[PDB]
Amino acid sequence: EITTLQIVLVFIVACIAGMGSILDEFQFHRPLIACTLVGIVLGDMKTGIIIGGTLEMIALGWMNIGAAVAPDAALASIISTILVIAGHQSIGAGIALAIPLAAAGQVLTIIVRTITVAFQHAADKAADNGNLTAISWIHVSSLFLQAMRVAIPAVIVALSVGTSEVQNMLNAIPEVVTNGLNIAGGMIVVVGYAMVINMMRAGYLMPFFYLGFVTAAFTNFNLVALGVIGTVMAVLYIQLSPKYNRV
Amino acid sequence: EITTLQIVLVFIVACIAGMGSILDEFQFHRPLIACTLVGIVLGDMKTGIIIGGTLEMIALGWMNIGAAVAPDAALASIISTILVIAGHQSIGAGIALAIPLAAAGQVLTIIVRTITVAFQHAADKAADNGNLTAISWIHVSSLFLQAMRVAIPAVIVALSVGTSEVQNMLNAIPEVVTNGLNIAGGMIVVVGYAMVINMMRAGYLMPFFYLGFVTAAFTNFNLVALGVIGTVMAVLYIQLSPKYNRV
Amino acid sequence: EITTLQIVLVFIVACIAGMGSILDEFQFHRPLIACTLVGIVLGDMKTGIIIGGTLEMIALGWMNIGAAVAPDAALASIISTILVIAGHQSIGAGIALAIPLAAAGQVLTIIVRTITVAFQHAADKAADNGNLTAISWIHVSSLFLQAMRVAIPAVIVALSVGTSEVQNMLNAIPEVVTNGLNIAGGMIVVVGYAMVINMMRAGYLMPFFYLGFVTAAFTNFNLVALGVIGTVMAVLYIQLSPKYNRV
Amino acid sequence: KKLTQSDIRGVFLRSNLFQGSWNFERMQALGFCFSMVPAIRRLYPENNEARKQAIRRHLEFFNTQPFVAAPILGVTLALEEQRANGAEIDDGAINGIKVGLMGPLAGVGDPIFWGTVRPVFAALGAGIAMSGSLLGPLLFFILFNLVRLATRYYGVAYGYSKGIDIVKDMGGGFLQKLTEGASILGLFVMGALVNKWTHVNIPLVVSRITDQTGKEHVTTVQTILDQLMPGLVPLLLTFACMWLLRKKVNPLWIIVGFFVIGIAGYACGLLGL
Amino acid sequence: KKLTQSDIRGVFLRSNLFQGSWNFERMQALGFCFSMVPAIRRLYPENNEARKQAIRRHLEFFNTQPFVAAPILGVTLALEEQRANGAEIDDGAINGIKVGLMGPLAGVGDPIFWGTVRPVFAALGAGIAMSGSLLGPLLFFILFNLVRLATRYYGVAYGYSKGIDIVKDMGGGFLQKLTEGASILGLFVMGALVNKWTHVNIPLVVSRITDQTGKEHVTTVQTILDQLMPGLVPLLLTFACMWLLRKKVNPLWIIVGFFVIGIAGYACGLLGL
Amino acid sequence: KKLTQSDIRGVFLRSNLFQGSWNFERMQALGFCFSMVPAIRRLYPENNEARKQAIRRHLEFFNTQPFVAAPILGVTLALEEQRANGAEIDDGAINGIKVGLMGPLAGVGDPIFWGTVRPVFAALGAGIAMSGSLLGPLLFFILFNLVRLATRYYGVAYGYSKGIDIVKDMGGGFLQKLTEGASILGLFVMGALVNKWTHVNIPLVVSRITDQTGKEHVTTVQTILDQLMPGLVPLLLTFACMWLLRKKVNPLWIIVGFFVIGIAGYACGLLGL
Numbered sequence A, B, C: 001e002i003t004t005l006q007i008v009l010v011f012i013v014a015c016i017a018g019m020g021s022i023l024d025e026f027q028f029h030r031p032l033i034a035c036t037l038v039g040i041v042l043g044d045m046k047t048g049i050i051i052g053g054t055l056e057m058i059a060l061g062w063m064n065i066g067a068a069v070a071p072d073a074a075l076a077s078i079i080s081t082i083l084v085i086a087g088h089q090s091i092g093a094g095i096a097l098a099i100p101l102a103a104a105g106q107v108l109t110i111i112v113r114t115i116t117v118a119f120q121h122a123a124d125k126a127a128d129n130g131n132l133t134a135i136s137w138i139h140v141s142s143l144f145l146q147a148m149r150v151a152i153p154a155v156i157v158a159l160s161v162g163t164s165e166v167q168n169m170l171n172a173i174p175e176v177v178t179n180g181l182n183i184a185g186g187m188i189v190v191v192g193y194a195m196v197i198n199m200m201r202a203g204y205l206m207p208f209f210y211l212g213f214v215t216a217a218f219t220n221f222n223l224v225a226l227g228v229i230g231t232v233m234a235v236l237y238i239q240l241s242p243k244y245n246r247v
Numbered sequence D, E, F: 001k002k003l004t005q006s007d008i009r010g011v012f013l014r015s016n017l018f019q020g021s022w023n024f025e026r027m028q029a030l031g032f033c034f035s036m037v038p039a040i041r042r043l044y045p046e047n048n049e050a051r052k053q054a055i056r057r058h059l060e061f062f063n064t065q066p067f068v069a070a071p072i073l074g075v076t077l078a079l080e081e082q083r084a085n086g087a088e089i090d091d092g093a094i095n096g097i098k099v100g101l102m103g104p105l106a107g108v109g110d111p112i113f114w115g116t117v118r119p120v121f122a123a124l125g126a127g128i129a130m131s132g133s134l135l136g137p138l139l140f141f142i143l144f145n146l147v148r149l150a151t152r153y154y155g156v157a158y159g160y161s162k163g164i165d166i167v168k169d170m171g172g173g174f175l176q177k178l179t180e181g182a183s184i185l186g187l188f189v190m191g192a193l194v195n196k197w198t199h200v201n202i203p204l205v206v207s208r209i210t211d212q213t214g215k216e217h218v219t220t221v222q223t224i225l226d227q228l229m230p231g232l233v234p235l236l237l238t239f240a241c242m243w244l245l246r247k248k249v250n251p252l253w254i255i256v257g258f259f260v261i262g263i264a265g266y267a268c269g270l271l272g273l
């Protein structure tokens, strides 16, 4: 099935989605881009984009806040599509199997961050002399060691999924458990929401929660329309509210 | 049809819904609870709950305000279900026949309130001596005389409905009049609304009337959703409106 | 087809819709009233009202602002219905042919306004002597000269449409062009909107644009409902916004 | 003598059946003595002057709403220690406070509980009692018999610990918020009830053909009005009835008018379901 | 000499046909003399100096909106008694007030009546004139010829009883309210008109199969954009045309551009109904 | 020595990969030296004292958000001329400003970009990634990698031209607006996501007949709750989980609870799709 010119592409896409795990700027540390990018290289694209869409809804509220490392949606979204796109499985099985991988997750990315200290104990020895090139190639060199620990476990998998030992041990789930995880896949997502609302919770703005709640039950807006009505409401509230008018 | 162990239950439910006519706290003085409670004891429950739902829509704005006695939705909602649940009739016939009963209504509950004076002219003679038990059994004793004048006319009916003299005099309506009262049953309800809006009418809050009007025509919210959007709008209006800011 | 007792009625309706071109009060200078009035006299009424409805959507933002003469929706909406109601054509053909007539339009109504100066150079000679009747019959007399230049080109047409020379030169369009103008009839209307929004554009009120935009995409309100929600929102915004509360 | 905490629990339970003996000579007067019986139980022994207070609890009206009567109960409870324990002389002002809180609280409580509470819960639990079974007459009984209890327990407790001093304090500003927020909810809901939860239909046909292989393309007057706004006729009927009620016409004399119209209008084709 | 009440009724009826003789040398100038003829009828007999006022009514421009010209008419009517009866000397300031109210009222009246009144009623009565028959071109003629009459009768009467003193008074604060509330309604309605009451369609197919036993599951470009927002392309076209119009391009030179596009776009499959 | 305009262009491009070497001893510390390398390139030659500044850039934490770090970069760039060119003595306060802007900007940036930006674009582009193909994972990558770039380029440029003086200026008032408007959008969207974009179903039947010639008129518990509000159960589950998270329970220990419930609930008929 998987050919040698797909292993390299999966490896490079995992490396890209391993740079983003700490870098947190272009957001390949997201189960959306890291999933479409794997779906394109491995095979069919729609069945990877659907995994991507489903996996973010959990991975809202999976941020890093001050040495509180997130559950690493960057490794849980590359192993969890090779086990669907490549080996013959269903969406809800991969979504359920992502959680232990996300637990692997921050355990790995905490050891990497801890062992990164040798890149600063070798940085002061450079600042004491210069030049800055000794720093511009030490800051990047600590990035080629985290991308090689989200992209190696994505080649151990994509070379062992292609055997009967795993492809037959993944069918004794059984089918009763599988349909019991496609049901938790509509419930676990709620946790991802509660972590978000806990950040942006003000007692006087909770009326905007239950307002965006009811208008979802009985109306057929998109999320683009609900994201535009939200900003219009926010701008008009800031325009009113004489807290910003006077003393 | 009606058995002796249903007469007593109807009598007790009428007594309960006769306590509430003046008491006005737990709201059996309402054609909703007083109707489901009669429907359960008499027979089928859904066809009593429907009467209850229909009869409140009229009995909004049927309050007491300072010796302006309401039309007594507590007697008009017990005779008006025995004449439907027990004797073989239709919803709109009972809703139409409730209005003369509601007129009976405050005529009865005004005579009772007027003759209650003997419970206070016999109260001062107790305060001049004590103890307070002479008061704690005089305040309640004036409650066992109003519940016995909304629950006795609910046994004169439920023992005379079971005869051909009334059950055959109630069919020469005729059927042309009956369907002309199921049409007024969508119009008389408006009076119940106008009495309510007349209480809570402020010239500057009328924009919230025509706003809750239009949003009803073109949207499929519930009344729970329209009761939640209303409170969200009210809280946010009170949050703005610098009348509560400035000094 | 067209009878002598229809020519006079078309002439009078054009005169009425020619008074309004400058007068701008009762609004026969509108492709709605000037179209139903021609549809009634000429023939079928619905197929004229539809032209009227379609032609205003373009003729929003076709106002006069300080010697910036509008494209004269009063001549473009009378010739453009005689060429549909009377001569055997389609709606989109007339809507497309209205634009050159509207260009005729202000060219005519500017020459008329310019040559009106002789009614004021003959007005001062009246104020120097009196009475005012010399003015009350000079102000109106300048109105019987503009209505006779929106109502004469509406009789040259309605007496030449009834010939094969024009009725056969109007079929070599061809049908490919016709369906390419019923497509521009959903696009040209946008210009009429942009001229309006350019008048009432405030940077802080643009949130009410994109709010009335989104609520149109995903909801089934009328324009009466959207015109009532708009006024409710405006009244409540003016009620808030402490710019009108303090110093 | 240090009214026990459980005594307040007692006054709460004994205040549930407040409305009397709702007389016409002295409205709710006996109900106030009955609600204050537990206080006078341990506050006094049997005595001439100690048991003349029940006389003054009857001395005049106490005609307010049953639900905004917990603050008054708590305030008048607090006044007793200052007359029993503190012995700070006060005879007329105990009734003075009753009369002073009679006025505003009778006009700020009626347009809330009989305003945007009773017919708002009675409307939420009656759009369901039509179709459903036990989410209408049970969303009423749970949601309204809590709002009346949070208004009585939190009324008595919070109006007892705070004496006169914070009667004039929360009597300014807070209740304006509470009745301007009430009559926004109750106007938003009543605008919807007039529109959707009323039925008016006019079967007067005004248009023929009836193209498209036998569809009859019937367009009665109700379609013309539903082209503008789908609830117009009940809206106008509401403003007519809303205008009549200021003239103090009996609502039982406007309902009979509608009963006449529903018979004389269905027998001429004007009105009809 | 005490302008009779019926004389104001006369000026109202004679002000309906205000716009002239809309010249280019003296815009609406003769229309002002014509509107003030009834005042000068009983105010003066035939005289040299008494009949030179018609000269000063022509003396300059009077170029404002026809509908915000009733306050000016009422103010200038009131100025006449103080020059006729009161004889308080004023020659230049009568035109001074005309010129002073020319400026602001020409810029506060145009973005209302040609702003959020004419194309708002013209839009309410044109979404109906498409389907319906007489609720479109009649909800316009009734609802717009009232708002222009309530602006003229209540303009003249209320600007006559109040002289100069309450020109500087209601010229501050009220009109800001009236034009900030106008451009909220007119922006809310124009946002909806751009979205729903425009038609743009792109039939470019971008996707094959076509599963489910011959349904063809066609997904043109219009479905992709309707997945985001169902009115996007007309919205962008509006901002393009809304940007062009500040550069004072003729709207008759942007409509022809669309006529070119609708032919060159339907002949290549780009645009199509 | 007059940091060239292109040098700011360089610091922008070199600040994109800000987060390190995100250590635990000195978080983001090396990333700050790396972002300021281009400044120190032309600011200094090779020297003892001239090249000790890289020591002070490591001297302590710099632990803020990657996106609200452009104002700090621009301010600290401006501080260098006043230490290099102006030579105005300042050693401790360069780190003083870093530490002073660490605190507020770490708490005002996290509840925006990880607040109402990342999971709002991640929700807009994930309701589409389910059905659609490339309008979900591309409306994210375009719309979020612009908001992070407008926060960095306009951060560095606008925080460089303005030194300390307008740190205390825009640090008061503007960010309150920016985080009260953020947590309105992010609350409005999260209220909708909890309702519609969650699935909870309860197949417990509670009612028989089943009239109308074999329709079975089945009414499970989900119909009873959908009669009140069509998203009630996920709403209550959200408040349960929203209460658990304040107690700092691992979200990986609440997800496993749901995995247990989804198995033990589907095997008893409680939960079921």
Ligand SMILES: OC[C@H]1O[C@H](O)[C@@H](O)[C@@H](O)[C@@H]1O
Pocket: B024, B063, B064, B065, B066, B067, D019, D027, D028, D063, D064, D065, D066, D106, D107, D109, D110
């Ligand atoms: O407002 C006066 C008062 O009258 C009655 O006594 C009470 O039942 C209430 O209806 C009302 O509060």
Ligand SMILES: OC[C@H]1O[C@H](O)[C@@H](O)[C@@H](O)[C@@H]1O
Pocket: C024, C063, C064, C065, C066, C067, E019, E027, E028, E063, E064, E065, E066, E106, E107, E109, E110
């Ligand atoms: O604003 C100047 C003025 O110009 C014309 O004279 C009038 O018709 C109006 O269109 C406008 O108010």
Ligand SMILES: OC[C@H]1O[C@H](O)[C@@H](O)[C@@H](O)[C@@H]1O
Pocket: A024, A063, A064, A065, A066, A067, F019, F027, F028, F063, F064, F065, F066, F106, F107, F109, F110
């Ligand atoms: O708030 C502290 C800070 O912690 C980490 O270093 C960053 O990735 C951000 O998540 C956050 O801004």
